[PDB]
Amino acid sequence: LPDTVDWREKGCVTEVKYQGSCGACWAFSAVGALEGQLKLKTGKLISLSAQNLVDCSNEEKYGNKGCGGGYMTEAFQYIIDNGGIEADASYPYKAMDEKCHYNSKNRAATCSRYIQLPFGDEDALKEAVATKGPVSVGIDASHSSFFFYKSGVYDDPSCTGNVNHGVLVVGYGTLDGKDYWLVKNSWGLNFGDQGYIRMARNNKNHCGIASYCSYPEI
Ligand SMILES: *C(=N)CNC(=O)[C@@H]1CN(S(=O)(=O)c2ccccc2Cl)C[C@H]1C(=O)N1CCOCC1
């Protein structure tokens, strides 16, 4: 496995999005991972519709609750079941719960299956990020050191394994002798380091980052 990986280098990451008031982190994380796979397979870098997931996967079958929150694995299950997802250009982001208006004529991507990585296994998350592409993860993102992060490696001892926020791992590395995960957030460009955060890697599943990892397969 390489020492440093950053999928932005291979042009497999879209622009950082802003979820606003809607609790759609799980939908941005899911689309982020699928965008990665879409680029690696087709050569197309397209921002996929988080709104398509928010409106259409809000059922008993999935357990997604739109702006009330949801799961990356279930967003992937919706794409498999639906036979596709639209691009953000045809199904724009509203930051509200709306009635489903999916149109297969504007389908931009498909998904055949998703892979779940072993709970709390940082070594398996590292292999997947390096060899498969960006990975959807859950983190405890509830502490002020996370919200007000600006640089360096985020290594807060008040962080817990009690995850509450879906993000996207787009890489890893080591900064000033501290291993990190390169995380793409959905809180706009004005969060962290241009929408990104470097979070402690190999530090006992810090923030529960390796607890609930998944990535789709086209
Ligand atoms: C994001 N803006 C709001 N947070 C959520 O939507 C979270 C995302 N997850 S998670 O905590 O990352 C997670 C936990 C356990 C297994 C897998 C994952 Cl991805 C869950 C979701 C959430 O808070 N809820 C509570 C309300 O019902 C839907 C799920």
JSON list of C-alpha atoms and ligand atoms in Angstrom, two decimals:
[
{"chain": "A", "resi": 1, "resn": "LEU", "atom": "CA", "xyz": [0.00, 0.00, 0.00]},
{"chain": "A", "resi": 2, "resn": "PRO", "atom": "CA", "xyz": [1.34, 3.57, -0.70]},
{"chain": "A", "resi": 3, "resn": "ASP", "atom": "CA", "xyz": [2.35, 5.91, 2.18]},
{"chain": "A", "resi": 4, "resn": "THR", "atom": "CA", "xyz": [0.14, 8.77, 0.94]},
{"chain": "A", "resi": 5, "resn": "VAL", "atom": "CA", "xyz": [-3.12, 8.63, -1.05]},
{"chain": "A", "resi": 6, "resn": "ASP", "atom": "CA", "xyz": [-5.31, 11.58, -2.11]},
{"chain": "A", "resi": 7, "resn": "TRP", "atom": "CA", "xyz": [-8.05, 10.84, -4.71]},
{"chain": "A", "resi": 8, "resn": "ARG", "atom": "CA", "xyz": [-8.31, 14.56, -5.72]},
{"chain": "A", "resi": 9, "resn": "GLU", "atom": "CA", "xyz": [-4.96, 13.91, -7.55]},
{"chain": "A", "resi": 10, "resn": "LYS", "atom": "CA", "xyz": [-6.67, 11.26, -9.79]},
{"chain": "A", "resi": 11, "resn": "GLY", "atom": "CA", "xyz": [-9.66, 13.63, -10.26]},
{"chain": "A", "resi": 12, "resn": "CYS", "atom": "CA", "xyz": [-12.03, 11.19, -8.45]},
{"chain": "A", "resi": 13, "resn": "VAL", "atom": "CA", "xyz": [-13.50, 13.80, -6.01]},
{"chain": "A", "resi": 14, "resn": "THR", "atom": "CA", "xyz": [-16.17, 16.42, -6.78]},
{"chain": "A", "resi": 15, "resn": "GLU", "atom": "CA", "xyz": [-16.32, 19.99, -5.32]},
{"chain": "A", "resi": 16, "resn": "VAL", "atom": "CA", "xyz": [-17.10, 20.20, -1.54]},
{"chain": "A", "resi": 17, "resn": "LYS", "atom": "CA", "xyz": [-20.87, 20.55, -0.97]},
{"chain": "A", "resi": 18, "resn": "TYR", "atom": "CA", "xyz": [-22.88, 22.49, 1.65]},
{"chain": "A", "resi": 19, "resn": "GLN", "atom": "CA", "xyz": [-25.75, 20.56, 3.26]},
{"chain": "A", "resi": 20, "resn": "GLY", "atom": "CA", "xyz": [-27.14, 23.59, 5.13]},
{"chain": "A", "resi": 21, "resn": "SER", "atom": "CA", "xyz": [-30.01, 22.95, 7.62]},
{"chain": "A", "resi": 22, "resn": "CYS", "atom": "CA", "xyz": [-30.88, 19.50, 6.15]},
{"chain": "A", "resi": 23, "resn": "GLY", "atom": "CA", "xyz": [-29.32, 16.49, 7.98]},
{"chain": "A", "resi": 24, "resn": "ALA", "atom": "CA", "xyz": [-28.17, 15.00, 4.64]},
{"chain": "A", "resi": 25, "resn": "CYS", "atom": "CA", "xyz": [-24.51, 14.19, 5.55]},
{"chain": "A", "resi": 26, "resn": "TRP", "atom": "CA", "xyz": [-25.29, 10.47, 4.84]},
{"chain": "A", "resi": 27, "resn": "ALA", "atom": "CA", "xyz": [-26.57, 11.38, 1.30]},
{"chain": "A", "resi": 28, "resn": "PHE", "atom": "CA", "xyz": [-23.45, 13.51, 0.44]},
{"chain": "A", "resi": 29, "resn": "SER", "atom": "CA", "xyz": [-21.15, 10.76, 1.81]},
{"chain": "A", "resi": 30, "resn": "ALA", "atom": "CA", "xyz": [-22.96, 8.09, -0.31]},
{"chain": "A", "resi": 31, "resn": "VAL", "atom": "CA", "xyz": [-22.83, 10.22, -3.54]},
{"chain": "A", "resi": 32, "resn": "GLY", "atom": "CA", "xyz": [-19.20, 11.09, -2.82]},
{"chain": "A", "resi": 33, "resn": "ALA", "atom": "CA", "xyz": [-18.26, 7.38, -2.73]},
{"chain": "A", "resi": 34, "resn": "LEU", "atom": "CA", "xyz": [-20.31, 6.62, -5.89]},
{"chain": "A", "resi": 35, "resn": "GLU", "atom": "CA", "xyz": [-18.78, 9.66, -7.76]},
{"chain": "A", "resi": 36, "resn": "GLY", "atom": "CA", "xyz": [-15.38, 8.14, -7.00]},
{"chain": "A", "resi": 37, "resn": "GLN", "atom": "CA", "xyz": [-16.38, 4.78, -8.57]},
{"chain": "A", "resi": 38, "resn": "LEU", "atom": "CA", "xyz": [-18.17, 6.56, -11.50]},
{"chain": "A", "resi": 39, "resn": "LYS", "atom": "CA", "xyz": [-14.91, 8.38, -12.42]},
{"chain": "A", "resi": 40, "resn": "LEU", "atom": "CA", "xyz": [-12.66, 5.27, -12.08]},
{"chain": "A", "resi": 41, "resn": "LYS", "atom": "CA", "xyz": [-14.99, 3.22, -14.35]},
{"chain": "A", "resi": 42, "resn": "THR", "atom": "CA", "xyz": [-16.28, 5.75, -16.99]},
{"chain": "A", "resi": 43, "resn": "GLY", "atom": "CA", "xyz": [-13.75, 8.65, -16.76]},
{"chain": "A", "resi": 44, "resn": "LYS", "atom": "CA", "xyz": [-16.73, 10.95, -15.95]},
{"chain": "A", "resi": 45, "resn": "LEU", "atom": "CA", "xyz": [-16.43, 13.19, -12.82]},
{"chain": "A", "resi": 46, "resn": "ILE", "atom": "CA", "xyz": [-20.09, 14.10, -12.07]},
{"chain": "A", "resi": 47, "resn": "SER", "atom": "CA", "xyz": [-21.69, 15.49, -8.85]},
{"chain": "A", "resi": 48, "resn": "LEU", "atom": "CA", "xyz": [-24.46, 12.96, -8.11]},
{"chain": "A", "resi": 49, "resn": "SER", "atom": "CA", "xyz": [-27.85, 13.84, -6.58]},
{"chain": "A", "resi": 50, "resn": "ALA", "atom": "CA", "xyz": [-27.87, 13.81, -2.76]},
{"chain": "A", "resi": 51, "resn": "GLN", "atom": "CA", "xyz": [-31.46, 15.25, -3.14]},
{"chain": "A", "resi": 52, "resn": "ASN", "atom": "CA", "xyz": [-32.47, 12.09, -5.11]},
{"chain": "A", "resi": 53, "resn": "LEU", "atom": "CA", "xyz": [-31.43, 10.03, -2.02]},
{"chain": "A", "resi": 54, "resn": "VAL", "atom": "CA", "xyz": [-33.11, 12.47, 0.49]},
{"chain": "A", "resi": 55, "resn": "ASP", "atom": "CA", "xyz": [-36.53, 12.38, -1.24]},
{"chain": "A", "resi": 56, "resn": "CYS", "atom": "CA", "xyz": [-36.67, 8.81, -2.61]},
{"chain": "A", "resi": 57, "resn": "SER", "atom": "CA", "xyz": [-35.00, 6.52, 0.01]},
{"chain": "A", "resi": 58, "resn": "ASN", "atom": "CA", "xyz": [-37.29, 7.79, 2.87]},
{"chain": "A", "resi": 59, "resn": "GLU", "atom": "CA", "xyz": [-39.14, 4.45, 3.42]},
{"chain": "A", "resi": 60, "resn": "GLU", "atom": "CA", "xyz": [-39.56, 1.61, 6.02]},
{"chain": "A", "resi": 61, "resn": "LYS", "atom": "CA", "xyz": [-37.52, -0.69, 3.66]},
{"chain": "A", "resi": 62, "resn": "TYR", "atom": "CA", "xyz": [-34.42, 1.60, 3.99]},
{"chain": "A", "resi": 63, "resn": "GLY", "atom": "CA", "xyz": [-34.55, 3.36, 7.35]},
{"chain": "A", "resi": 64, "resn": "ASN", "atom": "CA", "xyz": [-33.41, 6.66, 5.80]},
{"chain": "A", "resi": 65, "resn": "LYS", "atom": "CA", "xyz": [-35.35, 9.69, 7.09]},
{"chain": "A", "resi": 66, "resn": "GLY", "atom": "CA", "xyz": [-34.36, 12.37, 4.52]},
{"chain": "A", "resi": 67, "resn": "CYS", "atom": "CA", "xyz": [-33.33, 15.59, 6.34]},
{"chain": "A", "resi": 68, "resn": "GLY", "atom": "CA", "xyz": [-33.85, 13.66, 9.60]},
{"chain": "A", "resi": 69, "resn": "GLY", "atom": "CA", "xyz": [-30.77, 11.56, 8.82]},
{"chain": "A", "resi": 70, "resn": "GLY", "atom": "CA", "xyz": [-29.94, 8.20, 7.28]},
{"chain": "A", "resi": 71, "resn": "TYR", "atom": "CA", "xyz": [-27.30, 5.67, 6.21]},
{"chain": "A", "resi": 72, "resn": "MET", "atom": "CA", "xyz": [-24.77, 5.46, 3.42]},
{"chain": "A", "resi": 73, "resn": "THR", "atom": "CA", "xyz": [-25.33, 1.63, 3.07]},
{"chain": "A", "resi": 74, "resn": "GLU", "atom": "CA", "xyz": [-29.08, 2.20, 2.69]},
{"chain": "A", "resi": 75, "resn": "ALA", "atom": "CA", "xyz": [-28.54, 5.02, 0.15]},
{"chain": "A", "resi": 76, "resn": "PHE", "atom": "CA", "xyz": [-26.46, 2.45, -1.82]},
{"chain": "A", "resi": 77, "resn": "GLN", "atom": "CA", "xyz": [-29.27, -0.13, -1.42]},
{"chain": "A", "resi": 78, "resn": "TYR", "atom": "CA", "xyz": [-31.76, 2.43, -2.79]},
{"chain": "A", "resi": 79, "resn": "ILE", "atom": "CA", "xyz": [-29.48, 3.00, -5.90]},
{"chain": "A", "resi": 80, "resn": "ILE", "atom": "CA", "xyz": [-29.19, -0.80, -6.47]},
{"chain": "A", "resi": 81, "resn": "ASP", "atom": "CA", "xyz": [-33.00, -1.24, -6.10]},
{"chain": "A", "resi": 82, "resn": "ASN", "atom": "CA", "xyz": [-33.94, 1.86, -8.16]},
{"chain": "A", "resi": 83, "resn": "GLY", "atom": "CA", "xyz": [-31.54, 0.83, -10.97]},
{"chain": "A", "resi": 84, "resn": "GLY", "atom": "CA", "xyz": [-29.89, 4.24, -10.70]},
{"chain": "A", "resi": 85, "resn": "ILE", "atom": "CA", "xyz": [-29.48, 7.80, -9.43]},
{"chain": "A", "resi": 86, "resn": "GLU", "atom": "CA", "xyz": [-29.71, 11.17, -11.22]},
{"chain": "A", "resi": 87, "resn": "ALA", "atom": "CA", "xyz": [-26.89, 13.76, -11.41]},
{"chain": "A", "resi": 88, "resn": "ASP", "atom": "CA", "xyz": [-27.11, 16.87, -9.16]},
{"chain": "A", "resi": 89, "resn": "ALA", "atom": "CA", "xyz": [-27.55, 18.97, -12.39]},
{"chain": "A", "resi": 90, "resn": "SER", "atom": "CA", "xyz": [-30.88, 17.29, -13.23]},
{"chain": "A", "resi": 91, "resn": "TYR", "atom": "CA", "xyz": [-32.01, 16.76, -9.56]},
{"chain": "A", "resi": 92, "resn": "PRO", "atom": "CA", "xyz": [-30.59, 19.79, -7.62]},
{"chain": "A", "resi": 93, "resn": "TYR", "atom": "CA", "xyz": [-30.00, 20.07, -3.87]},
{"chain": "A", "resi": 94, "resn": "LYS", "atom": "CA", "xyz": [-32.88, 21.83, -1.99]},
{"chain": "A", "resi": 95, "resn": "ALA", "atom": "CA", "xyz": [-31.88, 21.09, 1.70]},
{"chain": "A", "resi": 96, "resn": "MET", "atom": "CA", "xyz": [-35.56, 20.04, 2.37]},
{"chain": "A", "resi": 97, "resn": "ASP", "atom": "CA", "xyz": [-37.70, 16.85, 2.36]},
{"chain": "A", "resi": 98, "resn": "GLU", "atom": "CA", "xyz": [-39.54, 16.78, -1.00]},
{"chain": "A", "resi": 99, "resn": "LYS", "atom": "CA", "xyz": [-41.66, 14.26, -2.91]},
{"chain": "A", "resi": 100, "resn": "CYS", "atom": "CA", "xyz": [-39.57, 11.87, -5.02]},
{"chain": "A", "resi": 101, "resn": "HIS", "atom": "CA", "xyz": [-39.24, 12.90, -8.72]},
{"chain": "A", "resi": 102, "resn": "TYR", "atom": "CA", "xyz": [-36.65, 10.37, -9.97]},
{"chain": "A", "resi": 103, "resn": "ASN", "atom": "CA", "xyz": [-36.53, 10.09, -13.79]},
{"chain": "A", "resi": 104, "resn": "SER", "atom": "CA", "xyz": [-34.45, 7.21, -15.27]},
{"chain": "A", "resi": 105, "resn": "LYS", "atom": "CA", "xyz": [-34.03, 9.36, -18.46]},
{"chain": "A", "resi": 106, "resn": "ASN", "atom": "CA", "xyz": [-31.61, 11.54, -16.41]},
{"chain": "A", "resi": 107, "resn": "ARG", "atom": "CA", "xyz": [-29.89, 8.60, -14.60]},
{"chain": "A", "resi": 108, "resn": "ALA", "atom": "CA", "xyz": [-26.16, 9.42, -14.36]},
{"chain": "A", "resi": 109, "resn": "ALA", "atom": "CA", "xyz": [-24.88, 6.41, -12.36]},
{"chain": "A", "resi": 110, "resn": "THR", "atom": "CA", "xyz": [-25.71, 2.85, -11.26]},
{"chain": "A", "resi": 111, "resn": "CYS", "atom": "CA", "xyz": [-24.69, 0.58, -8.35]},
{"chain": "A", "resi": 112, "resn": "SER", "atom": "CA", "xyz": [-24.57, -3.25, -8.31]},
{"chain": "A", "resi": 113, "resn": "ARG", "atom": "CA", "xyz": [-23.43, -3.81, -4.65]},
{"chain": "A", "resi": 114, "resn": "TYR", "atom": "CA", "xyz": [-21.78, -2.25, -1.62]},
{"chain": "A", "resi": 115, "resn": "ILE", "atom": "CA", "xyz": [-18.91, -3.57, 0.49]},
{"chain": "A", "resi": 116, "resn": "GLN", "atom": "CA", "xyz": [-18.89, -3.19, 4.28]},
{"chain": "A", "resi": 117, "resn": "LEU", "atom": "CA", "xyz": [-15.49, -3.15, 5.93]},
{"chain": "A", "resi": 118, "resn": "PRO", "atom": "CA", "xyz": [-14.77, -4.81, 9.35]},
{"chain": "A", "resi": 119, "resn": "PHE", "atom": "CA", "xyz": [-15.86, -2.78, 12.43]},
{"chain": "A", "resi": 120, "resn": "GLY", "atom": "CA", "xyz": [-12.98, -0.68, 13.84]},
{"chain": "A", "resi": 121, "resn": "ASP", "atom": "CA", "xyz": [-10.37, -2.03, 11.37]},
{"chain": "A", "resi": 122, "resn": "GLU", "atom": "CA", "xyz": [-8.10, 0.89, 10.28]},
{"chain": "A", "resi": 123, "resn": "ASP", "atom": "CA", "xyz": [-5.82, -1.46, 8.29]},
{"chain": "A", "resi": 124, "resn": "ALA", "atom": "CA", "xyz": [-8.80, -2.65, 6.14]},
{"chain": "A", "resi": 125, "resn": "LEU", "atom": "CA", "xyz": [-10.01, 0.99, 5.67]},
{"chain": "A", "resi": 126, "resn": "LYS", "atom": "CA", "xyz": [-6.45, 1.91, 4.49]},
{"chain": "A", "resi": 127, "resn": "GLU", "atom": "CA", "xyz": [-6.40, -0.94, 1.90]},
{"chain": "A", "resi": 128, "resn": "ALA", "atom": "CA", "xyz": [-9.89, 0.02, 0.58]},
{"chain": "A", "resi": 129, "resn": "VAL", "atom": "CA", "xyz": [-9.02, 3.77, 0.26]},
{"chain": "A", "resi": 130, "resn": "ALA", "atom": "CA", "xyz": [-5.73, 2.86, -1.56]},
{"chain": "A", "resi": 131, "resn": "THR", "atom": "CA", "xyz": [-7.01, 0.13, -3.91]},
{"chain": "A", "resi": 132, "resn": "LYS", "atom": "CA", "xyz": [-10.79, 0.78, -4.35]},
{"chain": "A", "resi": 133, "resn": "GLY", "atom": "CA", "xyz": [-11.23, 4.54, -3.97]},
{"chain": "A", "resi": 134, "resn": "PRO", "atom": "CA", "xyz": [-13.01, 6.97, -1.60]},
{"chain": "A", "resi": 135, "resn": "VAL", "atom": "CA", "xyz": [-14.87, 5.34, 1.35]},
{"chain": "A", "resi": 136, "resn": "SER", "atom": "CA", "xyz": [-18.08, 6.38, 3.16]},
{"chain": "A", "resi": 137, "resn": "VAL", "atom": "CA", "xyz": [-17.51, 6.39, 6.95]},
{"chain": "A", "resi": 138, "resn": "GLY", "atom": "CA", "xyz": [-19.31, 7.38, 10.12]},
{"chain": "A", "resi": 139, "resn": "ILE", "atom": "CA", "xyz": [-17.60, 9.64, 12.72]},
{"chain": "A", "resi": 140, "resn": "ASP", "atom": "CA", "xyz": [-18.30, 11.31, 16.06]},
{"chain": "A", "resi": 141, "resn": "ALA", "atom": "CA", "xyz": [-18.31, 14.89, 14.71]},
{"chain": "A", "resi": 142, "resn": "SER", "atom": "CA", "xyz": [-20.00, 16.52, 17.72]},
{"chain": "A", "resi": 143, "resn": "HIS", "atom": "CA", "xyz": [-17.05, 18.27, 19.46]},
{"chain": "A", "resi": 144, "resn": "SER", "atom": "CA", "xyz": [-16.02, 21.98, 19.11]},
{"chain": "A", "resi": 145, "resn": "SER", "atom": "CA", "xyz": [-12.45, 20.95, 18.10]},
{"chain": "A", "resi": 146, "resn": "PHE", "atom": "CA", "xyz": [-14.05, 19.20, 15.09]},
{"chain": "A", "resi": 147, "resn": "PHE", "atom": "CA", "xyz": [-16.39, 22.12, 14.14]},
{"chain": "A", "resi": 148, "resn": "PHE", "atom": "CA", "xyz": [-13.63, 24.73, 14.59]},
{"chain": "A", "resi": 149, "resn": "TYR", "atom": "CA", "xyz": [-10.81, 22.63, 13.02]},
{"chain": "A", "resi": 150, "resn": "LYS", "atom": "CA", "xyz": [-8.54, 24.59, 10.65]},
{"chain": "A", "resi": 151, "resn": "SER", "atom": "CA", "xyz": [-5.19, 22.69, 10.24]},
{"chain": "A", "resi": 152, "resn": "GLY", "atom": "CA", "xyz": [-2.92, 19.85, 11.42]},
{"chain": "A", "resi": 153, "resn": "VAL", "atom": "CA", "xyz": [-4.12, 16.37, 12.51]},
{"chain": "A", "resi": 154, "resn": "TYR", "atom": "CA", "xyz": [-7.38, 16.34, 14.51]},
{"chain": "A", "resi": 155, "resn": "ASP", "atom": "CA", "xyz": [-6.64, 14.21, 17.59]},
{"chain": "A", "resi": 156, "resn": "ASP", "atom": "CA", "xyz": [-9.12, 15.15, 20.30]},
{"chain": "A", "resi": 157, "resn": "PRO", "atom": "CA", "xyz": [-9.25, 12.88, 23.40]},
{"chain": "A", "resi": 158, "resn": "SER", "atom": "CA", "xyz": [-12.90, 13.91, 24.07]},
{"chain": "A", "resi": 159, "resn": "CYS", "atom": "CA", "xyz": [-13.86, 12.15, 20.76]},
{"chain": "A", "resi": 160, "resn": "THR", "atom": "CA", "xyz": [-15.90, 8.92, 21.20]},
{"chain": "A", "resi": 161, "resn": "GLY", "atom": "CA", "xyz": [-16.87, 5.84, 19.14]},
{"chain": "A", "resi": 162, "resn": "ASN", "atom": "CA", "xyz": [-20.51, 7.05, 19.22]},
{"chain": "A", "resi": 163, "resn": "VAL", "atom": "CA", "xyz": [-20.80, 8.09, 15.55]},
{"chain": "A", "resi": 164, "resn": "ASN", "atom": "CA", "xyz": [-23.40, 10.67, 14.39]},
{"chain": "A", "resi": 165, "resn": "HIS", "atom": "CA", "xyz": [-22.16, 12.03, 11.06]},
{"chain": "A", "resi": 166, "resn": "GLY", "atom": "CA", "xyz": [-21.48, 10.54, 7.64]},
{"chain": "A", "resi": 167, "resn": "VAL", "atom": "CA", "xyz": [-18.34, 11.72, 5.79]},
{"chain": "A", "resi": 168, "resn": "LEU", "atom": "CA", "xyz": [-16.00, 10.60, 2.99]},
{"chain": "A", "resi": 169, "resn": "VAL", "atom": "CA", "xyz": [-12.45, 9.34, 3.32]},
{"chain": "A", "resi": 170, "resn": "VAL", "atom": "CA", "xyz": [-10.62, 10.46, 0.14]},
{"chain": "A", "resi": 171, "resn": "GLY", "atom": "CA", "xyz": [-7.13, 9.61, 1.33]},
{"chain": "A", "resi": 172, "resn": "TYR", "atom": "CA", "xyz": [-4.56, 9.28, 4.09]},
{"chain": "A", "resi": 173, "resn": "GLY", "atom": "CA", "xyz": [-0.97, 10.13, 4.94]},
{"chain": "A", "resi": 174, "resn": "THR", "atom": "CA", "xyz": [1.28, 11.37, 7.79]},
{"chain": "A", "resi": 175, "resn": "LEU", "atom": "CA", "xyz": [1.60, 15.04, 8.84]},
{"chain": "A", "resi": 176, "resn": "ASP", "atom": "CA", "xyz": [4.40, 16.00, 11.32]},
{"chain": "A", "resi": 177, "resn": "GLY", "atom": "CA", "xyz": [4.83, 12.36, 12.45]},
{"chain": "A", "resi": 178, "resn": "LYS", "atom": "CA", "xyz": [1.03, 11.86, 12.92]},
{"chain": "A", "resi": 179, "resn": "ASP", "atom": "CA", "xyz": [-0.87, 9.47, 10.58]},
{"chain": "A", "resi": 180, "resn": "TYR", "atom": "CA", "xyz": [-4.16, 10.95, 9.31]},
{"chain": "A", "resi": 181, "resn": "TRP", "atom": "CA", "xyz": [-7.28, 10.16, 7.26]},
{"chain": "A", "resi": 182, "resn": "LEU", "atom": "CA", "xyz": [-8.12, 12.79, 4.59]},
{"chain": "A", "resi": 183, "resn": "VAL", "atom": "CA", "xyz": [-11.85, 13.50, 5.17]},
{"chain": "A", "resi": 184, "resn": "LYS", "atom": "CA", "xyz": [-14.21, 15.37, 2.82]},
{"chain": "A", "resi": 185, "resn": "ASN", "atom": "CA", "xyz": [-17.05, 16.99, 4.76]},
{"chain": "A", "resi": 186, "resn": "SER", "atom": "CA", "xyz": [-20.42, 18.37, 3.49]},
{"chain": "A", "resi": 187, "resn": "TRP", "atom": "CA", "xyz": [-20.38, 21.66, 5.54]},
{"chain": "A", "resi": 188, "resn": "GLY", "atom": "CA", "xyz": [-19.27, 23.86, 2.60]},
{"chain": "A", "resi": 189, "resn": "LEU", "atom": "CA", "xyz": [-15.83, 25.18, 1.65]},
{"chain": "A", "resi": 190, "resn": "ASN", "atom": "CA", "xyz": [-15.69, 27.39, 4.78]},
{"chain": "A", "resi": 191, "resn": "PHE", "atom": "CA", "xyz": [-15.54, 24.37, 7.13]},
{"chain": "A", "resi": 192, "resn": "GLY", "atom": "CA", "xyz": [-12.04, 23.22, 8.09]},
{"chain": "A", "resi": 193, "resn": "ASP", "atom": "CA", "xyz": [-9.29, 23.22, 5.42]},
{"chain": "A", "resi": 194, "resn": "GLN", "atom": "CA", "xyz": [-11.36, 24.13, 2.24]},
{"chain": "A", "resi": 195, "resn": "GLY", "atom": "CA", "xyz": [-14.15, 21.68, 3.35]},
{"chain": "A", "resi": 196, "resn": "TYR", "atom": "CA", "xyz": [-11.63, 19.01, 4.52]},
{"chain": "A", "resi": 197, "resn": "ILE", "atom": "CA", "xyz": [-10.32, 17.65, 7.78]},
{"chain": "A", "resi": 198, "resn": "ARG", "atom": "CA", "xyz": [-7.22, 15.53, 8.55]},
{"chain": "A", "resi": 199, "resn": "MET", "atom": "CA", "xyz": [-8.28, 13.12, 11.35]},
{"chain": "A", "resi": 200, "resn": "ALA", "atom": "CA", "xyz": [-6.03, 10.89, 13.50]},
{"chain": "A", "resi": 201, "resn": "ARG", "atom": "CA", "xyz": [-5.30, 7.47, 11.87]},
{"chain": "A", "resi": 202, "resn": "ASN", "atom": "CA", "xyz": [-3.87, 4.42, 13.75]},
{"chain": "A", "resi": 203, "resn": "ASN", "atom": "CA", "xyz": [-4.93, 6.05, 17.01]},
{"chain": "A", "resi": 204, "resn": "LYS", "atom": "CA", "xyz": [-7.36, 3.39, 18.44]},
{"chain": "A", "resi": 205, "resn": "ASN", "atom": "CA", "xyz": [-10.31, 4.01, 15.98]},
{"chain": "A", "resi": 206, "resn": "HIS", "atom": "CA", "xyz": [-10.32, 7.78, 16.84]},
{"chain": "A", "resi": 207, "resn": "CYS", "atom": "CA", "xyz": [-13.92, 9.26, 16.53]},
{"chain": "A", "resi": 208, "resn": "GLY", "atom": "CA", "xyz": [-15.16, 5.77, 15.44]},
{"chain": "A", "resi": 209, "resn": "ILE", "atom": "CA", "xyz": [-13.84, 6.52, 11.89]},
{"chain": "A", "resi": 210, "resn": "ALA", "atom": "CA", "xyz": [-13.24, 2.77, 11.11]},
{"chain": "A", "resi": 211, "resn": "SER", "atom": "CA", "xyz": [-16.46, 1.55, 12.81]},
{"chain": "A", "resi": 212, "resn": "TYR", "atom": "CA", "xyz": [-19.01, 1.84, 9.92]},
{"chain": "A", "resi": 213, "resn": "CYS", "atom": "CA", "xyz": [-17.16, 1.91, 6.55]},
{"chain": "A", "resi": 214, "resn": "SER", "atom": "CA", "xyz": [-18.66, 1.16, 3.15]},
{"chain": "A", "resi": 215, "resn": "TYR", "atom": "CA", "xyz": [-18.09, 1.79, -0.54]},
{"chain": "A", "resi": 216, "resn": "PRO", "atom": "CA", "xyz": [-20.21, 1.01, -3.61]},
{"chain": "A", "resi": 217, "resn": "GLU", "atom": "CA", "xyz": [-19.37, -1.07, -6.62]},
{"chain": "A", "resi": 218, "resn": "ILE", "atom": "CA", "xyz": [-20.77, -0.35, -10.12]},
{"chain": "B", "resi": 1, "resn": "LIG", "atom": "C1", "xyz": [-25.84, 14.19, 9.06]},
{"chain": "B", "resi": 1, "resn": "LIG", "atom": "N1", "xyz": [-25.95, 15.43, 8.72]},
{"chain": "B", "resi": 1, "resn": "LIG", "atom": "C2", "xyz": [-26.77, 13.70, 10.08]},
{"chain": "B", "resi": 1, "resn": "LIG", "atom": "N2", "xyz": [-26.36, 12.41, 10.62]},
{"chain": "B", "resi": 1, "resn": "LIG", "atom": "C3", "xyz": [-26.82, 11.24, 10.12]},
{"chain": "B", "resi": 1, "resn": "LIG", "atom": "O1", "xyz": [-27.57, 11.20, 9.14]},
{"chain": "B", "resi": 1, "resn": "LIG", "atom": "C4", "xyz": [-26.33, 9.97, 10.79]},
{"chain": "B", "resi": 1, "resn": "LIG", "atom": "C5", "xyz": [-25.39, 9.19, 9.88]},
{"chain": "B", "resi": 1, "resn": "LIG", "atom": "N3", "xyz": [-25.28, 7.90, 10.59]},
{"chain": "B", "resi": 1, "resn": "LIG", "atom": "S1", "xyz": [-23.90, 7.42, 11.38]},
{"chain": "B", "resi": 1, "resn": "LIG", "atom": "O2", "xyz": [-24.10, 7.84, 12.72]},
{"chain": "B", "resi": 1, "resn": "LIG", "atom": "O3", "xyz": [-22.80, 7.86, 10.60]},
{"chain": "B", "resi": 1, "resn": "LIG", "atom": "C6", "xyz": [-23.96, 5.64, 11.37]},
{"chain": "B", "resi": 1, "resn": "LIG", "atom": "C7", "xyz": [-24.29, 4.99, 12.55]},
{"chain": "B", "resi": 1, "resn": "LIG", "atom": "C8", "xyz": [-24.35, 3.60, 12.59]},
{"chain": "B", "resi": 1, "resn": "LIG", "atom": "C9", "xyz": [-24.14, 2.83, 11.46]},
{"chain": "B", "resi": 1, "resn": "LIG", "atom": "C10", "xyz": [-23.84, 3.46, 10.27]},
{"chain": "B", "resi": 1, "resn": "LIG", "atom": "C11", "xyz": [-23.75, 4.85, 10.23]},
{"chain": "B", "resi": 1, "resn": "LIG", "atom": "CL1", "xyz": [-23.42, 5.53, 8.68]},
{"chain": "B", "resi": 1, "resn": "LIG", "atom": "C12", "xyz": [-26.63, 7.61, 11.15]},
{"chain": "B", "resi": 1, "resn": "LIG", "atom": "C13", "xyz": [-27.45, 8.92, 10.98]},
{"chain": "B", "resi": 1, "resn": "LIG", "atom": "C14", "xyz": [-28.38, 9.20, 12.14]},
{"chain": "B", "resi": 1, "resn": "LIG", "atom": "O4", "xyz": [-28.03, 10.01, 12.99]},
{"chain": "B", "resi": 1, "resn": "LIG", "atom": "N4", "xyz": [-29.62, 8.62, 12.23]},
{"chain": "B", "resi": 1, "resn": "LIG", "atom": "C15", "xyz": [-30.50, 8.92, 13.39]},
{"chain": "B", "resi": 1, "resn": "LIG", "atom": "C16", "xyz": [-31.91, 9.25, 12.89]},
{"chain": "B", "resi": 1, "resn": "LIG", "atom": "O5", "xyz": [-32.33, 8.19, 12.03]},
{"chain": "B", "resi": 1, "resn": "LIG", "atom": "C17", "xyz": [-31.57, 7.96, 10.84]},
{"chain": "B", "resi": 1, "resn": "LIG", "atom": "C18", "xyz": [-30.13, 7.62, 11.25]}
]
